[PDB]
């Protein structure tokens with residue numbers, strides 16, 4: 289239905305941003321295409337992306353009102369669908385996905401991009417279960433010409449968002465993305481999100497800051513990954529662990545089945 293490609297089936301919906309499976313009549317190659325009708329910026333960021341744990345951009349076509357963004361197809365679906373509610377997933381799978389997630393985030397941060405909405409719905413799987421960080425509609429540049437800019441816009445998804453974003457006028461980009469990786473890791477290992485939002489008026493968040501790890505979800509989590517979560521989910525962003533230091537963590541380097 290667009291030039292050489294047939295639009296075969298709906299892969300996912302969105303806020304005026306639907307994604308279709310697209311197959312080339314000539315060559316049979318299947319990709320994914322996002323149909324939308326701001327996106328200049330998104331396209332600009334998408335064209336920068338070249339890494340095995342990040343979704344690839346193939347190109348775009350405007351056809352009147354509708355813009356078509358042609359992107360890598362992740363035929364394994366989302367990480368969201370591999371997480372069993374109240375259980376999670378086997379720790380070795382969770383570690384491998386975490387490794388890949390960190391590789392993606394290091395890449396993005398190294399090109400000065402912050403994703404700002406890391407969560408299991410946006411973490412897609414290829415056919416060999418390699419994880420790909422997808423959806424750059426909230427992404428932005430936080431480093432340009434080697435100069436950092438602080439962020440001030442609120443975005444993300446509350447249960448994944450770092451607390452400084454609810455409390456500070458301006459904050460550093462990178463620790464926000466790290467925080468959301470720790471909520472992802474929590475979800476993979478326990479099959480449940482720990483709080484609705486990281487605010488002191490939220491009892492489960494208060495409980496975590498008082499170290500009540502005999503409660504859920506923390507009691508489902510082995511002590512080694514939990515020690516890593518204690519370094520990631522730290523309320524002050526300048527004391528929170530950085531990715532270089534995550535890579536030296538004991539669990540991160542533990543050999544697992």
Ligand SMILES: COc1cc(C(=O)N2CCC(N3CCN(C)CC3)CC2)ccc1Nc1ncc2c(n1)N(C)c1ccccc1C(=O)N2C
Nearest residue numbers: 298299300307320359360361362363364365409410422423
């Ligand atoms: C075959 O490739 C995929 C399969 C599935 C999947 O598991 N489905 C397909 C949809 C299916 N139902 C959907 C509703 N329909 C009426 C009945 C069938 C349920 C099962 C989900 C995603 C697939 N691939 C895919 N790759 C790249 C993405 C992307 N998704 N989307 C939708 C994204 C989702 C979140 C964030 C980013 C993306 C994205 O940008 N792309 C390009």
Ligand SMILES: [Cl-]
Nearest residue numbers: 475479480481
């Ligand atoms: Cl969950």
